Amino acid sequence: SGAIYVGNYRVVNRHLATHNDWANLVWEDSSRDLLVSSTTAQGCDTIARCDCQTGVYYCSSRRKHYPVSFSKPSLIFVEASEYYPARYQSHLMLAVGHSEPGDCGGILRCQHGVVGIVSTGGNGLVGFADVRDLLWLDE
């Protein structure tokens, strides 16, 4: 579990979105595992606007923050699941690190702010859904 609260928006993994999230829908992309819904209160999360490849993410399964090196956002193959058929997920960044299914939602940050959220993992790797290109989150 986990969300990014920036201004009047809540950004969550599309596979984990609630009824409230779909009833207050702004944007959703199944191929990115992202869903953005509207909130009635203000959010103070800063979104990073950068090309950073290092940062720190929260791993709920270890109750710990881990520093990571990660790749550029890209189309990576993701295996089938109860949420999606086997497909290419776009805007995905991979890093070597620990993750478990309940780890989706954990925030990845750099010196400039929120980079993205945990969306995939397995085999000693963690995948992050990038949010740095969604410029409308701050406007």
Active site residues: 15, 33, 104
Q: Which one of residues 65, 122, 133, 138 is an interface residue with ligand A1BPX (CB under 6 A)?
A: 122
Distance CA 127, CA 70 (A): 9
Backbone angles phi, psi at 100, to 5 degrees: -130, 155
> Is the CB of residue 113 less than 8 Å from the CB of residue 138?
no
DSSP class per residue in 100-118:
-GGGTT-EEEETTEEEEEE
33 binds ligand A1BPX (CB under 6 A): yes
Q: Which one of residues 22, 77, 83, 136 is an interface residue with ligand A1BPX (CB under 6 A)?
A: 83
Q: Which one of residues 119, 132, 134, 137 is an interface residue with ligand A1BPX (CB under 6 A)?
A: 119
Q: Output 42 or 63, the one with its CB closest to ligand A1BPX.
A: 63
Consecutive H or E run containing 23: helix 19-23
3-state secondary structure of 16: helix
**Residue keyed to tokens 């881990």:** 66
DSSP state of 124: T
Q: Which one of residues 20, 30, 46, 50 is an interface residue with Zn ion (CB under 5 A)?
A: 50
Binding-site residue total for ligand A1BPX (CB under 6 A)? 16
Annotated binding residues for Zn(2+), written as ranges, equal 50, 52, 110, 112
Residues making contact with ligand A1BPX (CB under 6 A):
15, 33, 78, 81, 83-84, 89, 99-101, 103-104, 119-122
Residues making contact with Zn ion (CB under 5 A):
48, 50, 52, 110, 112
